[PDB]
Design an enzyme around this catalytic site. Sequence first.
Site, PDB file in Angstrom:
ATOM      1  N   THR A  80       1.305   0.856   2.283  1.00  0.00           N
ATOM      2  CA  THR A  80       0.401   0.215   3.232  1.00  0.00           C
ATOM      3  C   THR A  80       0.277  -1.278   2.963  1.00  0.00           C
ATOM      4  O   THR A  80       0.018  -2.055   3.890  1.00  0.00           O
ATOM      5  CB  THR A  80      -0.972   0.881   3.185  1.00  0.00           C
ATOM      6  OG1 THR A  80      -1.514   0.770   1.863  1.00  0.00           O
ATOM      7  CG2 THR A  80      -0.865   2.351   3.569  1.00  0.00           C
ATOM      8  N   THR A  81       0.459  -1.696   1.710  1.00  0.00           N
ATOM      9  CA  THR A  81       0.518  -3.122   1.409  1.00  0.00           C
ATOM     10  C   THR A  81       1.888  -3.694   1.748  1.00  0.00           C
ATOM     11  O   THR A  81       2.032  -4.907   1.944  1.00  0.00           O
ATOM     12  CB  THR A  81       0.185  -3.363  -0.063  1.00  0.00           C
ATOM     13  OG1 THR A  81       1.158  -2.706  -0.886  1.00  0.00           O
ATOM     14  CG2 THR A  81      -1.198  -2.819  -0.397  1.00  0.00           C
ATOM     15  N   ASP A 381      -0.910  12.123  -1.444  1.00  0.00           N
ATOM     16  CA  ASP A 381       0.240  11.233  -1.368  1.00  0.00           C
ATOM     17  C   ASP A 381       1.529  11.997  -1.628  1.00  0.00           C
ATOM     18  O   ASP A 381       2.587  11.639  -1.100  1.00  0.00           O
ATOM     19  CB  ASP A 381       0.073  10.095  -2.369  1.00  0.00           C
ATOM     20  CG  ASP A 381      -1.110   9.213  -2.042  1.00  0.00           C
ATOM     21  OD1 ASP A 381      -1.454   9.104  -0.846  1.00  0.00           O
ATOM     22  OD2 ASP A 381      -1.704   8.642  -2.979  1.00  0.00           O
TER      23      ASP A 381
END
Lengths: 513, 178, 65, 72, 73, 508, 118
Positions: A80-81, A381
Amino acid sequence: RDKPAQIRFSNISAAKAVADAIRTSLGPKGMDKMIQDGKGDVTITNDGATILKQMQVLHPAARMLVELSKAQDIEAGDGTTSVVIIAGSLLDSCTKLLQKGIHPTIISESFQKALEKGIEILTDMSRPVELSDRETLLNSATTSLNSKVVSQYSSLLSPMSVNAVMKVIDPATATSVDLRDIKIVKKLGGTIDDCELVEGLVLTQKVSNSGITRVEKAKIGLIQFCLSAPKTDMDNQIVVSDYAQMDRVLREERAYILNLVKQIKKTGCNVLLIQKSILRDALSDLALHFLNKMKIMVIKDIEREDIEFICKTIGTKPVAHIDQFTADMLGSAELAEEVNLNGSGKLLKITGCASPGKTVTIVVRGSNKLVIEEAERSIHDALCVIRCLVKKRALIAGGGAPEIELALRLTEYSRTLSGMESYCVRAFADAMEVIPSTLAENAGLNPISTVTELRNRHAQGEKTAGINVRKGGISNILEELVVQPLLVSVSALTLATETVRSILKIDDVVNTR
Amino acid sequence: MEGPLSVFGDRSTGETIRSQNVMAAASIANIVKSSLGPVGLDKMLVDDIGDVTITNDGATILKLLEVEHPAAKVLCELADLQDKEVGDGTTSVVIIAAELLKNADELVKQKIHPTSVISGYRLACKEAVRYINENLIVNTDELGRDCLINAAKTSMSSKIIGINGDFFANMVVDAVLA
Amino acid sequence: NTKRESGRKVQSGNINAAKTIADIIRTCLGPKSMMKMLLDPMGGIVMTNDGNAILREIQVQHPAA
Amino acid sequence: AGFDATNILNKLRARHAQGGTWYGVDINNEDIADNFEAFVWEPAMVRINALTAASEAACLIVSVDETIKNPR
Amino acid sequence: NPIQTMTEVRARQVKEMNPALGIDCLHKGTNDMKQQHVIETLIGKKQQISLATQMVRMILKIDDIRKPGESEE
Amino acid sequence: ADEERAETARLTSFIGAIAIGDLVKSTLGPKGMDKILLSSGRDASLMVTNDGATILKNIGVDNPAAKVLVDMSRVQDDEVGDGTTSVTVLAAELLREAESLIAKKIHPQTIIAGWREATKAAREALLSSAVDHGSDEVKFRQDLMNIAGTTLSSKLLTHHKDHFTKLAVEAVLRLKGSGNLEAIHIIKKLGGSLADSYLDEGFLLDKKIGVNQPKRIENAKILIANTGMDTDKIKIFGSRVRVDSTAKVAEIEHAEKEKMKEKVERILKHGINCFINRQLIYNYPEQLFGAAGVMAIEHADFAGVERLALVTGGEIASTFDHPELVKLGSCKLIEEVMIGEDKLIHFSGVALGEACTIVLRGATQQILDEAERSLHDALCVLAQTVKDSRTVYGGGCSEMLMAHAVTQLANRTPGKEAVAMESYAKALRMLPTIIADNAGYDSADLVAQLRAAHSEGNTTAGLDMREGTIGDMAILGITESFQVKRQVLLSAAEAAEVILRVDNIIKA
Amino acid sequence: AALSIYLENYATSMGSREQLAIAEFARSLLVIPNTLAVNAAQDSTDLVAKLRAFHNEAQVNPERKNLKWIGLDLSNGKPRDNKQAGVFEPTIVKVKSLKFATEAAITILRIDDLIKLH
């Protein structure tokens, strides 16, 4: 006028200046953030992914960066980063092309050829897997978790994830894994070692009267209604304004409910899920006790998500009143199980139920609530890695090495384009390499040395080799055995593509009336 | 204060906020410097406006203090971890780390891989522990020229009541055995 | 809170507080006593041969007082 | 020549903890090497003159913290 | 438009290498170098390579950028 | 208390147009870029707007001269379709030109006449290029396929454009003499595909069959009525009052379950299981209707009987007092189809005539909303092809056809008005300027070159700015109706001349 | 004192970039006997004088050696060569102090994405 040109320049410059400090990810790099709001709230942050989820920005181009991380989490759940720092690399290139004097419209369809060649070249370097094989599904999900926080929980939560998908997925060619299939529950009682993967549906219902039906003698009921009873859904035939009058409507209330709860005990349906449609906390608190006396696992005003899975998994549909002798659209259960680890936790397991071909469930336990949360995010995850392989089976290197490995190749294909878009994509193809350098850049003294060094070694490495992501140095990262699915990257290609294209679609900023 | 104040969260984005916290951590560390060891100086510290206390125990000082910086904050957190272990050695961990967080940003910046400076800190930590196990040059108290009596007499000479501690040496030898 | 004052400035600030207290009370000592006159902040005169009645009614400074 | 300048120095000190023969950096071979075996030569006396001269000026200026002027 | 101009002969380099077919500046719409007859000496262009990298080399020659008040004064 | 002089009121009229004309000129033409609406006055939201009505109405103009422009562009979009976009730019393009006339100090009445007779000059040149392509049936089939490719364009669609094309062309050709604007119905619902749009054989009502009700009703005889209930049914001459304390609030909410049983006794005497009503039911009434044997079909409307009126041969009626005042319904099969994410009952039977039902599939509300107006623009314009099979070259090729001839009539016919007639024709050529940058082409090389080119020969050659080149407007299918281009001229010409006659704004 | 020294001697053996990770670490050890000396009014300069004078290069062995010493008494702040005193703290209190003092500099590094919030 000067106004549309200056806002598009500023719409780039504002979100990029936000995205400049977002190049601080990948582990221990920088200084901590105790963030104080405009209201004064103490916000002590160390995790940049949740930072992107909580990111309060007023600038609307920077507000797309919020949704960029939201779309990255829902599609891949990984990096997501990473989708933001490549979108900050997009905001690097678009400035000078306008300073060159390129139309913002041309840069919009410049993004197409970057995307079209980009998904093509990453396909060429990726290798697919087999989605019925337990080994190839296991090697990738743990390798991603080894780059993540837990390393001792990676040994146990990953094969639970591999057996979770094979219940949900079909044999090899299939795309069926949803986050709206597997519920991740929280159980106080037990531990991370005591966690369990249950084949079927496990709902997190708070069930009173432990010591209940624990057997296969069970059916399950999702009711959109409540039991019709005097002073519950029927009426009293006297008026009440006195405490002496109050006792007379209490007696006729609980008397008819006793006739109601036995007929559900007559049915064999030991589970009743009541929606959020209140009249007096919709089904009476006198009524829940007599259901518990009939050992019926009940709750009132349950959340909407619990209603959605029990309609989805077994197929349970609402029925008529139990005095009206329910139309058997209730689900057929083969286990109603109340779970008690160390005497705590209220949980319902439905083992062996009907399924539409999907929907396995997990029981995430923990000695503390924090002990739940560590394995809860970790197995979640672990689900999203294989979920990328279900939607797209292919293996690329992990750690951002194919980001630069695409960049070494794309510039050659940028030369073959020979258009005006040839210069635009190449300006972004050079912008993609920045991920080991600019993540390192926001720390301390002696600044000039390390930056371009972290990008020469990949160009020196080759189109086939580059710098390592776990110890550094030039080696094959596949020979370093660091893998991730293709959908981790190619979704980050497409999601960043549309948003910065939409920045080119911005002109003459407005506010609603 | 250096850095911009138009943005929120006291963000200065770079070398100024890396120069901010080296000031915020050293000032915490400078308090322990006055109060370091048995010769360390006692500080009179006002609690609200009229309540005071006199301390040279650094962990007791950090219980009084209310942090307004992460450099103020994490020094209070790490020192209390040693405090619940023993309560001793909490003074040493505060003073050293202020220089350490000056040195760490300069080199973790300079990555081939960013944890190598951190692993270099841990390798330096493990290099200590090995030679820590190799120490018998100084500090034996399990024996002496005579016994634990020789340890205890110099220990009762370290705690002064005059020149005495000779008869008091035998008490400390008995106490683990009584 | 976060507060640090550098050494010499406080120890000298201890001197300036204590010596000024030691000024008039040395002259208030003994049969050669002077009188320490406190003017009230709401108006009014108080003088004795005891500064403790004087100091405890008035704003006591922090460092050594 | 293009290097992490400090990390070169760290490399040259290990070759002085292990060898210590002529280890320095190259600007024309662009690496670290023995500079006598890299044939970078110059007579030793001017270095000895430089070591004396750099020590002489440095101790002198620090010996003067008191400077007298005349603007007339 | 010079932005259009760099596009065309770039595609010609995909077509043909070592071009005698570059842009025109007579606005005839015939982009050549041998039929537009825009031909120069190879020694002259090679000299322009040496002179341009000379200047960037020349401004790099000392590391001194200090003045006594008089280095351009 | 504020009388604003002409010298600012004229200037307000121009800056009122320029500040809104630039907003949509990105979205005009084949739209190489869009307009991105930013929500901060009402909420925190973001809107991608190629719809000019979303641009005009959601951003309320505070220039009173611009208020005239929004209103007259609104009615043009309502009747014809794609009218907020085209009218507003052309009015704004005229008013940039009129400033130079006031800079030359031209009589404003000359500007009123100068655009007016040139508008008459343009429409005749627009009429000369108007040619029939809906002549034969294979021509009329391929006429509407290319026009629906153009009208559904200039909006944001993923794969929707080709399937909304071939669906509507089938709807127009079946009637042969009028367009279908009478009883076709645009149903939008949550679907899983961003490409699907299929015509219904029959019509559908929102009914998720639940508790114990059967899924298929056969041999239908529909009792059509307007009387219904939601949760309330009091007695005819009696009542029930249960309030004297705070404990009666819970018991007055429990009495709503017993109110539902009295309405079921009314339908039970009929013996008609096919009872439709305009009012809705919940999970609580639905257990009572189906238990009696008479099924309540909710979310009904006038549109269902009207769709049943034309194909079957019945009538639409209302005001259910006695059952002989509402025209009843008859069907063969009542089946529940599952369209998209939503389950609806569907009265299937005779179809395919003056009445259909169009169902849309998309999980995103923003994609469904833009697909409504894009389909809403064409169905009137495809009905205008039934009115006038004369098509005209879309994409600004017809724009240069008018700028070619008006400029010639700007020279010869006037004696003073030529400066006002030319500001018309120069503003006509500003329309290819706002689209040439969108495809990236030089606007100065576009507007004069092709205008002389296709007019002197091969008018089919026009602006193919999906390539940035010149293409053929009847070979590449980029052509639209003569009617839609005719109507957007008059609304654009009038509204500019209306606020040009404004030479005193007074704010009380 | 030897940890300030013989880790930097160990740091040179590691070679590259990680050398000054150990060296700046071992450099930061020096202030602890120094600031205690100022509190004992011994002032840090005879303290760095004696402890470097002890540590033998030819005998890097501590064993009980009469060729290098490492001890120091803190109540005077002056090195009294002692091994029976009560000022010499054991292994256990020191090895954990090396952990959290190392960890605190690591603790500030653990940020990703320095941002603001409205």
